[PDB]
Amino acid sequence: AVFYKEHKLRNDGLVITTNQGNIRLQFKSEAAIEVLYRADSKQLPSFALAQPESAIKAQLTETENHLQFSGGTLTARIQKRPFAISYYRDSELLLAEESGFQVKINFRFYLSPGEKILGGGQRILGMDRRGQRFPLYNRAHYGYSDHSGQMYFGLPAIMSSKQYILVFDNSASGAMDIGKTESDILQLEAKSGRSAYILVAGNSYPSLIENFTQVTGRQPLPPRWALGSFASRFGYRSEAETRATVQKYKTEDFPLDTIVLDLYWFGKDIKGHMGNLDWDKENFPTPLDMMADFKQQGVKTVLITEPFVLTSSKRWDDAVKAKALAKDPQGQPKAFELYFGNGGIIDVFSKEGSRWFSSIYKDLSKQGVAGWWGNLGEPEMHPEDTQHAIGDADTVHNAYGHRWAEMLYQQQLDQFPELRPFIMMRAGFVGSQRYGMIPWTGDVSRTWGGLASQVELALQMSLLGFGYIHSDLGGFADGETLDKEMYIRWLQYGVFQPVYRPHGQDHIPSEPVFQDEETKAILRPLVKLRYRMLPYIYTAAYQNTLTGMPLMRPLFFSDEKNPALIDNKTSYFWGDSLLVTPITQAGVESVSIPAPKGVWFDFWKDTRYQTDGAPLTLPTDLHTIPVLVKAGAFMPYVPAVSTTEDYRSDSLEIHYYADASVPLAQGEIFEDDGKDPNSIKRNQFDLLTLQATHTDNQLHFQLARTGKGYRGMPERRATTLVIHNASDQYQHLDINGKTIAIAQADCASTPALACYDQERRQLQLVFTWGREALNLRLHK
Template identity: 25%
Template sequence: MITNTELNNQGNVFPGKLTSFDHTVDTLMFSTDNGVILQLQVLRDSVLRFRYGVGGKMEDDFSYAIDHSGNRGYNKLEVSEHKDYYEVQTSKVLCRISKADLRSRIFDIDGKIICEDELGFHYEESYQYGGEIVKMSKKAQPGESYYGLGDKPADMNMRAKRFELWGTDQYAFGKQTDPLYKNVPFYVGLQNKTAYGIFFDNTFRSYFDFAHERHHVTSFWAQGGSMDYYFIYGPDVNSVVSGYTELTGKPELPPLWALGYHQCKWSYYPESNVREIAAKFRELQIPCDAIYLDIDYMDGFRCFTWDNDKFPDPTKMISDLREDGFKTIAIIDPGIKVDPDYSVYQEAMDNDYFCKRADGPYMKGKVWPGQCYFPDYTNPEVREWWAGLFKGLIADNGLSGIWNDMNEPAVMEVPNKTFPDDVRHDYDGHPCSHRKAHNIYGMQMARATYEGVKKFIYPKRPFVITRSAYSGTQRYTSSWFGDNVATWEHLSIANIQAQRMALSGMSFAGSDIGGFAEQPTGELFARWIALGVFHPFCRVHSSGDHGDQEPWTFDENVTNITRKFVELRYKLLPYLYTTFWQYAEEGTPMLKSLVIYDQEDAQTHYRNDEFIFGDQILVCPVLEPNAKGRRMYIPRGEWYNYWTRETITGGREEWVDADIDSIPLFVKSGSIIPRYPVMQYVGEKKIEFLTLDVYYTIGKEKSIVYEDANDGYDYKKGRFSLRNLKFKGSEKEMVISQYKDGKFKTEYETLRFNFIGLPFEIDYVEVDNAKIPLEELKYDVKTQTMYIHKEFSELHVVGK
């Protein structure tokens, strides 16, 4: 592995002196006397792209990560020449490019340094493979913190750490295991209360060093390709993540059922076992929306087939499960069994769709079916073929979603766990070796799967889950964190990974609740379910090797605790769905580490455990056995304890009671939180009223509630309901005003207000300036609830 010390070796080439400059619209070209080229492109006022070429030429401009439908354009672009540098100014930042060596310095418009090159761009020739090893080093400012890089199982703040990006099947990984399944070369830097992001769009094996080897230097480098990175200005962390997600693509809304509780195991078979599991959920009244089929549903692990002995009539089984409110999701891996009697294999052979070695033979590797060949998903023709294969599973059999696994790609019984470097790929018309394609192989498989599921499930919305991913994969799928272990350490890792993934633009993610490998105790499972219901993707999954892991596997107390927390998730579905809509619209993370929530509070910069679910709910899991509570950091502001309804002022650490059936949970004062009634599955009952929990405060707060048909695409035609709610409270009164947007008519007409922390006795209520008798509102003094049977613009509550 290349070390930072080697950055100073004589083999490195640095840009020479500037010899020419050109400015065309949004792009500036700088050329030097030793053939280094810098193309600086202004995508937005806050987004600059730095792309370097060597030998007087630029590589082809192609990326799987960038979403070209994203917002582009700027309000201001001025370029000026000075004695030693060129200055590029937008309405947000100033960028100076040195004439001596192309090193860059970026300032905010007040002249405060945000990000500056140390050695800057440099490279060395790769004598083993050809091309260049490209490198970039930047100054690490005193006190600067770093966050991101996807699913890394390390502390949130990456200062003084080094990481590698090379998608790897890491069964039973541990804390600090690196590399892992996903490849997200994006990080956020935070210094002097100002945040920025760097996205290094290079798919080769790459490395990030955050002041690990040299305390004043942060660097990133790759073993091939070009130095192509994007600078994204905040100044707040949330805006950086939003800007990155805008750049690499925002997701579509999933169907609402995909945000419910999912149950999975390796493996539920035969059919009678699947039906038994489903029946038990309904018998015990534990809500559940999806059941998964692992590799054993297939005929000899051949993808797109069924084992007719285990599943004699899968279409009827799936239909019956759907009648009882269960969606069925099945696994599909990339390895295609070498079998001339297997139609999928034969089609791919006939059309030359499999990956090949450099000298011509097909890439052969052992996976679950035995010896397999592997489709080249970087070939658009192969992706189209692969998408078409889902007609049987989706359109004919009735599956509701597909689960992609083993797509790092993973290969068994070989030292490097994956393809050899010499495997060739089409790369959408830019032929390359596996060195370049490895980190996006899983992404392109997930893309092809998504396109197939979307085509055949239309007019409903697709649901796909993937294990391996590269930046931009959020456009196509959700993901989980891979093969974890049933330990307390892994409960902590899951908490960090979910936050880190959300900060890396991939919010729709979660862990195998309870742990995939080994068997959790009832206490660990209870604590994990309490955390897992607050992750955007919520699925229990286990290997089955050490016993079952359904909610009823443990004692009755654990079963009841599981039901309690799953019911809480279903109550909060409108809040979670609204949060997803914000993510899909604005690119904002669904889970917010405390540093995102309040970066100006230095206490948040190294916090790992606490996070904000959406915008207004604070969660902190209990991560140790035999605990009756824990110390946690309460962010600044006023918060309500969800369970006791007591208020607390934040900005400090506090002990919070949380027995086995509880989790430290707080709601920001002034919030209006929407709730649905408990259902056993999404759509089970007609919603007769929407509950709005109003957490009183003296002051102002904004909340929103987004709803639509919960599936389909009518919302894109304006058929949605968006409630913009404003709360204003004083000592003796409160006003809730509402502006409603969208053409969707909800199935309920009644709003049930639940006032929490109201310090006064209500004298009268006005709805749109008309006094309404409390009896007509069915006001209950004890519970402080009332019902309004029509839409309103302003609700005015006055105390005695």
């Protein structure tokens, strides 16, 4: 039994007193509120909030039975007796406390009937997690396939079909019960830690996500090279093997930006060496030369590191001496028995641990390392009596990887202010995207079921802040022989998901260059396609930095008033314009694609489909997976290069999918130097915009460029615009007032400036796109 006693306004926050204690309500923006219970007491600080100190001016009003605390769009309605807070956007009820806060830490809320709930981070349970209960304790799930209640990267957060996100801003071992035990109750629980939640509201899913990343953090633009081709396995055993792999990409004509070194870079065995954090010189004898030789070919080197220092490692005595390891209650370094052997964990929450670990990353980065892979950050083993500077293991567990990322990000920015950090990690917390975290879905089995789960995992993580969530392409764990069809399908899917990193245990090759002739003939043009599409992908990345819009978007974005689409995990959007349906079983001869109402083109064949609502059935083939292009799309391409270090946009090729059903369309292409972390902040970019206006007798394109440019930006780009489904009735083209005849023959066979191909229904315009505005008008 709880009731309101009294309140006050202090530094813009509402502090309420009940019979049980203080409750602090601070608006972190007009659409987001932090509710801290036990506000009087000492607690762990917020991990989820980018600006935990902020509180914007809100309006407070009082009635007999209630208080009302409001920002722009979000309102807290505080019932006094009994005490219960509920939340409104306009006058629409978003979420209501049932018992609310109790004692262990426990929050209880009502779920509305029919409300669907996404959330929890990585689980394989279905997109709507209502009816499920699961722990909040990051933990490995080696060899998962088609089911998991608990894996590497949980998030104490949910997204509802009422268009709110609720964050449990707590780092401890806990649980979430989403109307499982009691059908109308959402229950959040933890053994300890901060007793706070954060509610964020939005008018649409895009703007919900914008509001969420506003308060939790925006991912800084990764380096363009993160969108390229990675060579990775577990693991290259030597410098010779690593050089041979870079050579294999060159001799097989596959693009390659980055080679990834797993744990053999620091010792010859899986066990016994972890914590060395230095080169195994028997097997990597000249590593500075190795890395420099790779940079000459435009190839970056990424190294694996882990949180654990073994007692057999060369750095045990030094870490103990520096007080860098987590301790037992007696105050000594805690040691425990990992797979790898007996060892400790670096205390990233301490000053000494942070300085010690940072110094090692600084040293190796000085040697030539371009980026970093932090594995086992759950932490994979984390005994409960381990003591970190700010709490015990069970209290801090779900924030360890988050602080690891923060530490490393700040260190990389301090060492290289002019470069974008690359940080790939397996486990984090809400807001870890602000430290550049690029997560992957862990040790997936080499099975169709492991592939079939990747879209679900990717969308769940994308929706709550993680644009660059990806998988070990081709699968990671076990297998005795390559499943060639599954491998091909996983790497085709790869092209249309955030990071192109095939990776597997090295008894079966993960890299496409080591595959048979048929597999390489299929995949080589697709990996080249990934490079030709960099302007599309990099522009979606730019949008993710600006607004949190994920790269992969769920089918349900296409119709916000049809909540049944929330269940789909088999088709998704890659950027604005491509509806992708990965093939996730062997021998599938056709697929039924639940395309939204409108006009759609076969990405591979140019075929036009119109649909009222009924799904489209497309046949399948082994060389592609089904991709449809939305009418009104602008798809930008550049020529394929071997490495993004060679990237040029001097030549553009843009494909516009015309249909009279889309009278107005827009596209953009974001160009910058691909490496400067301050490019967007300082407007050191070239933002190309394109607008189409499509009426009965004309098709008009308006082209423009903004921003201050960047060093090496071409002043003039040779541009080929290919208009698919173009009317055969266009008589002439006006370019900036200058009339040009449209040729009706020999388009492919003459240096034609405007040419209509009657057999393909494609009108091709070739022109120079300079810094001034350009208008292209086609008239019947």
